[PDB]
């Protein structure tokens, strides 16, 4: 029964707060919260490997990929552990987020506590872009905001 939280911040107007909750080990993880300051439309949403914010979102490394798979969408079996797809921002620029994933975990080997949550400028193409950059990052573009994922009460 673990809980986690992430405060997302960047150089710009993108910011928000994302909660995680896992009532059972190896159970699904609820992920929910809100992000604001986004251009309308889809934005890539991933757990990156390192919780290193010493050089902004850049020092967070690549997508969290302990099983060395290709980048994919969260529904797929061929995906990085950190591949959480897209969030969607309305015309106000507010992406309400409410998803549930049993690939990530708040315990064990796929644990994401202490790693980085990142929201991107462009839409994640979910590994369908037909080039090798798609199978690596989904062409989500630059990192607009990030935060370290920390244990919550």
């Amino acid at each position, epitope marked *: 029964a673990t809980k986690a939280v992430c405060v997302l911040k960047g150089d710009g107007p993108v910011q928000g707060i994302i909660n995680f909750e896992q009532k059972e080990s190896n159970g699904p993880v609820k992920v929910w919260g809100s992000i604001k300051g986004l251009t309308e439309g889809l934005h890539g949403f991933h757990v990156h490997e390192f919780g290193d914010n010493t050089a902004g979102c850049t020092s967070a490394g690549p997508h969290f990929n302990p099983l060395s798979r290709k980048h994919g969408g969260p529904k797929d079996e061929e995906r990085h552990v950190g591949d959480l797809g897209n969030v969607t921002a309305d015309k106000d620029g507010v992406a309400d987020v409410s998803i549930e994933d*049993s*690939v990530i975990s708040l315990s064990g080997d796929h644990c994401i506590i202490g790693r980085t949550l990142v929201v991107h400028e462009k839409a994640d193409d979910l590994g369908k872009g037909g080039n090798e950059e798609s199978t690596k990052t989904g062409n989500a573009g630059s990192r607009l905001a990030c935060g370290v994922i920390g244990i919550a009460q």
Partner: nanobody
Amino acid sequence: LQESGGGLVQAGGSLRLSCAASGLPYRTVFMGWFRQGPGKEREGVAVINADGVSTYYADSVKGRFTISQDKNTVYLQMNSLKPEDTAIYHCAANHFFDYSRDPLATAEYNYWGQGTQVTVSS
């Protein structure tokens, strides 16, 4: 996704379907039942979340069908069956779900069962 139950039943009667997930890469987020009637498009019937409590029912089966969960098996108790319920019923599942999406839409599920015939006479 192994399905059991099904078959023929007279109108008004009851039938229990079940589906046990075996050997899946990760735990299921949603698991449930879709159906395809003669000549029609596959539609969602009932799904249930990993918590075993949160459910979604097509409007056409509300109050007659009840999905529940054990064994990581799900059960579909079908009561007051009508000829319009005749269909091939597929178990289905995912390991992720975006609650902005439609939980009874086929596109939100990529694990699937082989199918079960259900025929309601009269």
